[PDB]
């Protein structure tokens, strides 16, 4: 009698480290066990830590996600007397914008769009969702594929602070982080289309 929950939006990722957390409040806030499945209902994702795809606590983790990994993934949440099966579409693309326009981000979802409000002190955010086993280094920021340097621009943890947002602050951005996991380092690169709207 497992109740199926379907995620609204698909999740897009470059071919790089990627993770998705199995969550469903208020159920997962209780005492439940979580099991990830890759196009199956019978054989669970491995928990071998050296496996390219594996479950890490409540997360499914790809180190890295690769072509062929696109699909519907399922998370089965079992409580004492409750069962929920969460469906989510995970889609990988192969290329990054600064390398080529080919085979990259297939559509510009809300997760790849951000807004900088003109004449104000605004910010951009580098969205990095990973299990605690993945340690994120400092974040480098790029504007039209060139490293950002300027007094108006300040790196504060996960955000890029932009003071006195100008008309020319629109365009293509990218944030880059080093991910360290189990003694090995991986690069995470996320693109953003920024506008004033």
């Amino acid at each position, epitope marked *: 009698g497992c109740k199926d929950i379907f995620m609204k939006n698909e999740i897009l990722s470059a071919s790089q480290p990627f993770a998705f957390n199995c969550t469903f409040p208020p159920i997962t806030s209780g005492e439940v066990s979580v099991t990830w499945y890759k196009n199956s209902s019978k054989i669970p994702v491995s928990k071998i830590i050296q496996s390219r795809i594996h479950q890490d606590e409540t997360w499914i983790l790809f180190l890295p996600m690769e072509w062929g990994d696109s699909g519907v993934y399922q998370c089965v949440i079992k409580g004492r007397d409750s069962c929920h099966r969460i469906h989510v579409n995970l889609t990988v693309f192969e290329k990054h*914008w*600064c*390398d*080529t*326009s*080919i*085979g*990259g*981000l*297939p*559509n*510009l*979802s809300d997760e*790849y769009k951000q807004i900088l409000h003109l004449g104000k002190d605004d910010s951009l955010t580098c969205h990095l969702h990973f299990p605690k086993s993945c340690v994120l280094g400092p974040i480098k920021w790029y504007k*039209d*594929c*060139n490293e950002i340097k300027g007094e108006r621009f300040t790196v504060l943890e996960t955000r890029l602070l932009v003071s006195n947002v100008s008309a020319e602050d*629109r*365009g*293509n951005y990218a944030c880059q982080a080093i991910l360290t996991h189990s003694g090995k380092q991986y690069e995470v690169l996320n*693109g953003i*289309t920024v506008s004033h709207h």
Partner: antibody, heavy 119, light 109 residues
Framework: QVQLVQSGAEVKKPGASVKVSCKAS????????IHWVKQAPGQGLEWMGE????????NYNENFRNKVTMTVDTSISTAYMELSRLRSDDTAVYYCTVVFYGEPYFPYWGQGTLVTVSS | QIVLTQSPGTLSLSPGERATMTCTAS???????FHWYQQKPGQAPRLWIY???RLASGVPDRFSGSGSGTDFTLTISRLEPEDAATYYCHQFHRSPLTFGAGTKLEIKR
């Protein structure tokens, strides 16, 4: 509204070179990839390569590796496509297009430039 | 290179009839990277269908695209005269980008 305006037709002698321009407006020039497309008379469409005016990276169709050189002058929002050592089979209409992040297709085209190679 | 084989090369049909053209790819193309263009003589190609099945701006509902992996199809439900043109398929999946050789649609009257 995105616009691409190309330079006029030209004739050039065999062995010479030609440089076609593509002037852009209606968007942030450095936030895009410019592509060039070849249409030989009566034939279909052949992709030549792409240039990113932001980091000036170029990726050429290797069938045009030693033929084409893509450049930009960002101060006037203009992309250039240069063909070297012209032969007869370089006679064709050339199109520039522009591509945006998350939109991997060609919605905007220049009007085309006919380049004729002749003595 | 991903080669796109487009057929038929020429289509000759009367108004109201159904038009079908196919594109077969030598390697799998993702559905988000497969597109069709319409070109009339003397004019630049116009984006017509993108992402296998989405209509570009100004494109009437009688046009529809479908396909998967290696087999794609453009269908025109009920032909109008303004549909006369050459249609090209296109993949944005893998470098170098490639186009089909085209299907020229002629309208009988």
């Amino acid at each position: 509204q995105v616009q691409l305006v190309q330079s006029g037709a030209e004739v050039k002698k065999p062995g010479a070179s030609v440089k076609v321009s593509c002037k852009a407006s209606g968007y942030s020039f450095t936030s895009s990839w410019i592509h060039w497309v070849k249409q030989a008379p009566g034939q279909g469409l052949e992709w030549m390569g792409e240039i990113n005016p932001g980091n000036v990276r170029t990726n050429y169709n290797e069938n045009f590796r030693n033929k084409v050189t893509m450049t930009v002058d960002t101060s006037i929002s203009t992309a250039y496509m240069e063909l070297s050592r012209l032969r007869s089979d370089d006679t064709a209409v050339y199109y520039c297009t522009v591509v945006f992040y998350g939109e991997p297709y060609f919605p905007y085209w220049g009007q085309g430039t006919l380049v004729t190679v002749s003595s | 290179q991903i080669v796109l084989t487009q057929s038929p090369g020429t289509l000759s049909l009367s108004p109201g009839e159904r038009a079908t053209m196919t594109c077969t790819a030598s390697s799998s193309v993702s559905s988000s990277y497969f597109h069709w263009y319409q070109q009339k003589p003397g004019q630049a190609p116009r984006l017509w269908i993108y992402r296998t099945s989405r209509l570009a701006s100004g494109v009437p509902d009688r046009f529809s695209g479908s396909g998967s992996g290696t087999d794609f199809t453009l269908t025109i439900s009920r032909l109008e005269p303004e549909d006369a043109a050459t249609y090209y398929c296109h993949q944005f999946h893998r470098s170098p980008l490639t186009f089909g050789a085209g299907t020229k649609l002629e309208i009988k009257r």
